[PDB]
Write an enzyme that holds these catalytic residues in place. Structure first.
Site, mmCIF file in Angstrom:
data_model
loop_
_atom_site.group_PDB
_atom_site.id
_atom_site.type_symbol
_atom_site.label_atom_id
_atom_site.label_comp_id
_atom_site.label_asym_id
_atom_site.label_seq_id
_atom_site.Cartn_x
_atom_site.Cartn_y
_atom_site.Cartn_z
ATOM 1 N N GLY A 13 48.378 -8.493 29.085
ATOM 2 C CA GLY A 13 48.674 -7.057 29.070
ATOM 3 C C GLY A 13 49.973 -6.729 28.347
ATOM 4 O O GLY A 13 50.906 -7.541 28.330
ATOM 5 N N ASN A 16 55.059 -0.692 28.060
ATOM 6 C CA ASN A 16 55.983 0.123 27.271
ATOM 7 C C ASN A 16 57.175 -0.709 26.787
ATOM 8 O O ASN A 16 57.419 -0.811 25.576
ATOM 9 C CB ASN A 16 56.471 1.327 28.084
ATOM 10 C CG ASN A 16 55.356 2.299 28.417
ATOM 11 O OD1 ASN A 16 54.175 2.006 28.225
ATOM 12 N ND2 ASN A 16 55.728 3.467 28.929
ATOM 13 N N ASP A 129 54.833 2.565 43.478
ATOM 14 C CA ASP A 129 53.898 2.476 42.364
ATOM 15 C C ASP A 129 52.580 1.851 42.824
ATOM 16 O O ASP A 129 52.022 0.964 42.168
ATOM 17 C CB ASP A 129 54.538 1.663 41.240
ATOM 18 C CG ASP A 129 53.820 1.822 39.918
ATOM 19 O OD1 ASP A 129 52.848 2.610 39.844
ATOM 20 O OD2 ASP A 129 54.236 1.149 38.948
HETATM 21 C C1 LIG Z 1 43.958 -2.534 35.458
HETATM 22 C C2 LIG Z 1 45.381 -2.577 34.909
HETATM 23 C C3 LIG Z 1 45.842 -3.844 34.186
HETATM 24 O O1 LIG Z 1 45.402 -4.090 33.086
HETATM 25 N N1 LIG Z 1 46.809 -4.649 34.790
HETATM 26 C C4 LIG Z 1 47.437 -5.863 34.355
HETATM 27 C C5 LIG Z 1 47.211 -6.396 33.093
HETATM 28 C C6 LIG Z 1 47.836 -7.568 32.703
HETATM 29 C C7 LIG Z 1 48.700 -8.234 33.555
HETATM 30 C C8 LIG Z 1 48.952 -7.725 34.817
HETATM 31 N N2 LIG Z 1 49.889 -8.427 35.733
HETATM 32 C C9 LIG Z 1 49.761 -9.635 36.350
HETATM 33 C C10 LIG Z 1 48.616 -10.599 36.296
HETATM 34 N N3 LIG Z 1 47.496 -10.239 35.542
HETATM 35 C C11 LIG Z 1 46.381 -11.061 35.445
HETATM 36 C C12 LIG Z 1 45.202 -10.677 34.615
HETATM 37 C C13 LIG Z 1 45.101 -9.599 33.780
HETATM 38 N N4 LIG Z 1 43.881 -9.603 33.198
HETATM 39 N N5 LIG Z 1 43.243 -10.608 33.608
HETATM 40 C C14 LIG Z 1 41.867 -10.956 33.192
HETATM 41 C C15 LIG Z 1 41.825 -11.787 31.968
HETATM 42 C C16 LIG Z 1 40.385 -12.178 31.625
HETATM 43 N N6 LIG Z 1 39.542 -10.988 31.405
HETATM 44 C C17 LIG Z 1 38.156 -11.379 31.083
HETATM 45 C C18 LIG Z 1 39.573 -10.084 32.573
HETATM 46 C C19 LIG Z 1 41.011 -9.670 32.923
HETATM 47 C C20 LIG Z 1 43.989 -11.313 34.478
HETATM 48 C C21 LIG Z 1 46.399 -12.269 36.118
HETATM 49 N N7 LIG Z 1 47.500 -12.635 36.877
HETATM 50 C C22 LIG Z 1 48.609 -11.811 36.977
HETATM 51 N N8 LIG Z 1 49.697 -12.238 37.766
HETATM 52 N N9 LIG Z 1 50.860 -9.888 37.100
HETATM 53 C C23 LIG Z 1 51.673 -8.837 36.942
HETATM 54 C C24 LIG Z 1 52.923 -8.594 37.493
HETATM 55 C C25 LIG Z 1 53.581 -7.412 37.175
HETATM 56 C C26 LIG Z 1 52.983 -6.492 36.316
HETATM 57 C C27 LIG Z 1 51.721 -6.745 35.777
HETATM 58 C C28 LIG Z 1 51.080 -7.935 36.104
HETATM 59 C C29 LIG Z 1 48.322 -6.536 35.203
#
Ligand SMILES: *CCC(=O)Nc1cccc(-n2c(-c3nc(-c4cnn(C5CCN(C)CC5)c4)cnc3N)nc3ccccc32)c1
EC number: 2.7.10.2
Length: 269
Positions: A13, A16, A129
């Site tokens: 992800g 900002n 949040d």
């Molecule tokens: C729905 C909102 C969103 O997209 N949230 C988000 C995206 C990316 C990272 C975080 N985030 C983590 C965290 N994220 C994951 C994660 C994100 N996406 N996946 C999957 C990957 C494979 N695809 C096929 C489906 C989605 C896994 C995994 N583990 C963690 N820890 N951790 C944090 C901590 C703070 C802010 C954001 C975080 C969230």
């Protein structure tokens, strides 16, 4: 964690100011490590650095099967290492697998976030949040609370924090006075219940619905809510779930339930 051994895999992800990455911690140097989520800030003013250093501390001090488990840090730019939850955030999870999921499951996910938040309360911590997007899915059976990037701890002899330094999940006294509390997160929880039982449907999402109900936003929302306007009952949402939301959305925070009070009600449905 040694920076050089946090071998990059992919990006999960992009925010900002900061973004999260998927890495494998392979210290032996033989492609055999452990999969962790790593978080950094790219271009970020001092205001965002001070915040990131709290998150690392807050998240480190939390030990709950309903919060993302802190693993460590790296180089100290400072990187925050956490466990990897491959099912990704609940908001996008409920969308995809809406068919297979039923009320029983949504209750389950509610119960767990409730218990999760409750634990934060015991730590005198305000998430600030709390929404379906900031939940993560360990498994079909387990969800964890995430992004403590705006979390603040309570002043040591006070129930509330006035923040000087998102909108559709806030409470009136957070909209009007920027006051934050445990009791404000109960409001926010009322919203996540809405999100849960709409399967986070974009069309009638909390954002869309408050926009369809009404010059800037904050003041138009604060007025609507002060006038007694609340989010609609979700399509097939059960009566008890809808009542718990209304109680969550009470104007006076002292009248809103506690997560201690909420849990048992959700679990006995
Ligand atoms: C729905 C909102 C969103 O997209 N949230 C988000 C995206 C990316 C990272 C975080 N985030 C983590 C965290 N994220 C994951 C994660 C994100 N996406 N996946 C999957 C990957 C494979 N695809 C096929 C489906 C989605 C896994 C995994 N583990 C963690 N820890 N951790 C944090 C901590 C703070 C802010 C954001 C975080 C969230």
């Amino acid at each position: 964690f040694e920076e050089r051994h946090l071998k990059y895999i992919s990006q999960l992800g992009k925010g900002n100011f900061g973004s999260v990455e998927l890495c494998r911690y392979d210290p032996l140097g033989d492609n055999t490590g452990a999969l962790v989520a790593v978080k950094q800030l790219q271009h970020s003013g001092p205001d965002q650095q001070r915040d990131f250093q709290r998150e690392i501390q807050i998240l480190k001090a939390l030990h709950s099967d309903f919060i993302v488990k802190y693993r460590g840090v790296s180089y100290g730019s400072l990187r925050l290492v956490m466990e990897y939850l491959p099912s990704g955030c609940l908001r996008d999870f409920l969308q995809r697998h809406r068919a297979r999921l039923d009320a029983s499951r949504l209750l389950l996910y509610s119960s767990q976030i409730c218990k999760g938040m409750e634990y934060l309360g015991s730590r005198r911590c305000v998430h600030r949040d709390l929404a379906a997007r900031n939940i993560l899915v360990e498994s079909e059976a387990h969800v964890k609370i995430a992004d403590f990037g705006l979390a603040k701890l309570l002043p040591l002899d006070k129930d509330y924090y006035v923040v000087r330094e998102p909108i559709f999940w806030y409470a009136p006294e957070s909209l009007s006075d920027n006051i934050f509390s445990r009791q404000s997160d109960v409001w926010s929880f009322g919203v996540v219940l809405y999100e849960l039982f709409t399967y986070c449907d974009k069309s009638c999402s909390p954002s869309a619905e408050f926009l369809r109900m009404m010059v800037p936003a904050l003041s138009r929302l604060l007025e609507l809510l002060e006038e007694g306007q609340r989010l609609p009952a979700p399509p097939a949402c059960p009566a008890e779930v809808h009542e718990l939301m209304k109680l969550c959305w009470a104007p006076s925070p002292q009248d809103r339930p506690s997560f201690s009070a909420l849990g048992p009600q959700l679990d006995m449905l």
